[PDB]
RNA sequence: CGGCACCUUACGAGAAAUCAAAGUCUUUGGGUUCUGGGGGGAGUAUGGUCGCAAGGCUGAAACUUAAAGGAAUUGACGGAAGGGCACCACCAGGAGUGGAGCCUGCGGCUUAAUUUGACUCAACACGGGGAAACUCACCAGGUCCAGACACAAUAAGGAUUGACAGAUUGAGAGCUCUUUCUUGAUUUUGUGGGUGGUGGUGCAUGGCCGUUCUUAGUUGGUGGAGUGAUUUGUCUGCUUAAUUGCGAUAACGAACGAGACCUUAACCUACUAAAUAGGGUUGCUGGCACUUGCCGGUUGACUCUUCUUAGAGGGACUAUCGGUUUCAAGCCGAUGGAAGUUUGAGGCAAUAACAGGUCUGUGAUGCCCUUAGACGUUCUGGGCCGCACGCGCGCUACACUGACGGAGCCAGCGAGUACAACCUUGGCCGAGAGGUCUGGGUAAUCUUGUGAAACUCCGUCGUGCUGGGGAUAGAGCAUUGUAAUUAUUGCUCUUCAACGAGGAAUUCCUAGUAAGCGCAAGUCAUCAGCUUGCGUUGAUUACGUCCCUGCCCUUUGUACACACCGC
């Protein structure tokens, strides 16, 4: 957002950049293109006998 | 910048030589009226001809006569 | 035991460089001599004294001045030293430019006026600046108020508005002086007060742009080093296009910049699709050979999506293998693969800036100027285009890898009108240019397969300033416009100039590039030698280096900090 401001002495040039957060952008991507968030893995118990569970 | 030229002769818009209660028209009796010069043929009466040496015109139609009177 | 000599912490010091003394000093006192008290004036004047002298020792003030110094810190810079990077650097090469003619910019001169802005890269085919008027700012001349608003002088016995006729006037400018008719309180005459200005100042500003730099640079949070400015992180090395990474490490983890990203250029017999994209069978239908077969033409039918488009996806990640490299980052070579140069090309693009440009894009604007015979506007005629002559982009050629004729004959970006006059096929006229009638198109439909050139084939001239080369020239025929002379441009005939590959110099370039070739829109009523794109033809030589040039860092030195155009 640019906007000139006229005053008695002269002009003042106002510029404003607002970097909106990715999560609240909606249109387009919801995250930055370089960021790679990896999900946390889930634990499992090995072995515990061969076993079966029938129906 | 370059200097202004200065010949000298200036020409102003003419003030017009305004005149009212002009000596056109007359009355002799009192009751009736006696028109001087003549009224316009093209437009209605009330407007009056301009009189010169065999040359006429009127101002409501800017200037549009030719025939004498 | 003795003199001519390193490292860490300093708790001891020190303004700090540093110092094992320059320590045991505001926790102030071991014993002594000598010297200094802002800088300059000045080691001068004077006197003494010492000398053969030159000079020495001794030693002022008046007056002057706000700094003089020291140490270091960051910079900037250096005809210091190392290490990087780049075809805006060079090699190895190509194409060149610089010469020739001509276009066009810019000087210089000229001129009423040949308007102005900008001069190393980062001024000079730039101002989208190819000016016939307009544009336009300049000149010669004329016109016009577009003098908002406030307040008085006329206030209708007119305020001021108009005004055919010819002289007037460049001139069917009422521009006015000849005129004597209109016009009705708008105005208008002043005084406050605005308004406009391609007037000024870009070294008063905004915004935008250019440039340092598209280079690889920039930052802060802790933590450590310093009293401190600061510094380290941000670095020996090796990598990378990149502060790209790997590593080594009072630094750890981060952000910006780069990368990622985006757009486009490439692949899809795998999807979704089409008589505004293309094919297949078949109908009718033209010609052939004449057997069934070959080329066609028709939006007659039916069906398809390979090419087309363009939606959704995948696909490349340096993949697999080999070496090479502390067996790291990576790099080098083969294999496959549409693609293995960051896959190609761009779009964006940090911190800090520059007194870079633009107040002639701007109702972006400060202040100054100007401000009703304007530097406002507006008409009219010119001028930006003039020529002893410099440089700068450019085009055309110096021919035989050609020229000229025929013939063959293939692109991609585009663009294109209804209130205007756009592209304009198809038919007739014209040697041409160009005219005409008619269409089709508001556009994958029509122009348009834009059957563009350079190319390819067969013939004519053969290495002679020749048919190379086409300049200057004269004439006519066309068109655009109100206006073409200071040829607008096109065409027709005629004239045939310079120039046999261009010295010193210097530009551009690493692959579908270079160079050639044309098209294309942009500006545009009319004008392409310009420009942004496009495709067509398509190489030579590297695939390295710091020799030059520039730039970057590091270490160094600095009386510089308005920073070498310095002091
Ligand atoms: Mg004047
Ligand atoms: Mg003193
Ligand atoms: Mg440069
Ligand atoms: Mg010119
Ligand atoms: Mg150019
Ligand atoms: Mg012209
Ligand atoms: Mg203006
Ligand atoms: Mg102005
Ligand atoms: Mg400036
Ligand atoms: Mg300047
Ligand atoms: Mg700190
Ligand atoms: Mg640093
Ligand atoms: Mg390997
Ligand atoms: Mg790329
Ligand atoms: Mg078409
Ligand atoms: Mg000849
Ligand atoms: Mg041009
Ligand atoms: Zn009349």
Swiss-Prot record, chain B:
The chain holds residues 82 to 150 of 150 of the full protein. Coiled coil: none annotated. The gene is ubi3. Part of the 40S ribosomal subunit. It comes from the Eukaryota. This is Small ribosomal subunit protein eS31. Transmembrane segments: none annotated. It comes from Kluyveromyces lactis (strain ATCC 8585 / CBS 2359 / DSM 70799 / NBRC 1267 / NRRL Y-1140 / WM37) (Yeast). Component of the 40S subunit of the ribosome. A zinc finger (C4-type) spans 40-61.
